[PDB]
């Protein structure tokens, strides 16, 4: 007695799968490859992407105050007129903001 596994499963490696949001890929002069993270304005060598397993059986309008614009050179970027600041990252790709901890001067109850 037993039964065989009915499992169907797809594996897609990192690099068959698109970059996470806010990231961009680039090359050095020497054609070496590296990555830019516009969510925090950093760069590293280490590809952010992760492999994907998946079982098989059983755009939009810019937020208020934001502008999409293009330099003389033809590069695309984003503008916050309510802040007078600029970014490489489409505002629409942002996740919700970090909600700061409650204030030190606030009303609270003690547990430990
Ligand atoms: Ca661009
Ligand atoms: Ca760029």
Residue numbers in the entry: 140 to 197, 214 to 267
Recite the paper's sentences:
WW domains organize molecular assemblies by binding to short, proline rich peptide motifs each with ~4–6 residues. The type I WW domains bind to a consensus ‘PPxY’ motif (where P is proline, x is any amino acid and Y is tyrosine, also known as PY-motif) with very modest affinities (with Kd in the range of a few to a few tens of µM). To achieve this goal, we determined the high resolustion structures of 7 representative WW tandem/target complexes, and measured the binding constants of >100 WW domain tandems or isolated WW domains binding to known or previously unknown targets. In this study, we discovered that WW tandems, but not individual WW domains, can bind to target proteins with extremely high affinity and with very high sequence specificity.
The two WW domains of YAP are also arranged next to each other forming a WW domain tandem. We were able to obtain high diffraction quality crystals when the Dendrin PY23 sequence was fused to either the N- or C-termini of the YAP WW tandem. We solved the structures of these two versions of the complex. Although each WW domain engages the ‘PPxY’ motif following the canonical type I WW/target bindings, the overall structure of the YAP WW tandem/Dendrin PY23 complex differs substantially from those of the KIBRA/MAGI2 WW tandems in complex with the same ligand in two distinct aspects. First, the inter-domain linker of the YAP WW tandem is unstructured and there is no C-terminal helix following YAP WW2. Thus, the two WW domains of YAP do not form a supramodule due to very limited inter-domain contact. Second, the Dendrin PY23 binds to the YAP WW tandem in a parallel orientation (i.e. PY2 binds to WW1 and PY3 binds to WW2), instead of the antiparallel binding orientation observed for the KIBRA/MAGI2 WW tandems. This is again likely attributed by the lack of inter-domain interactions between the two WW domains of YAP so that each domain can freely choose its more preferred PY-motif.
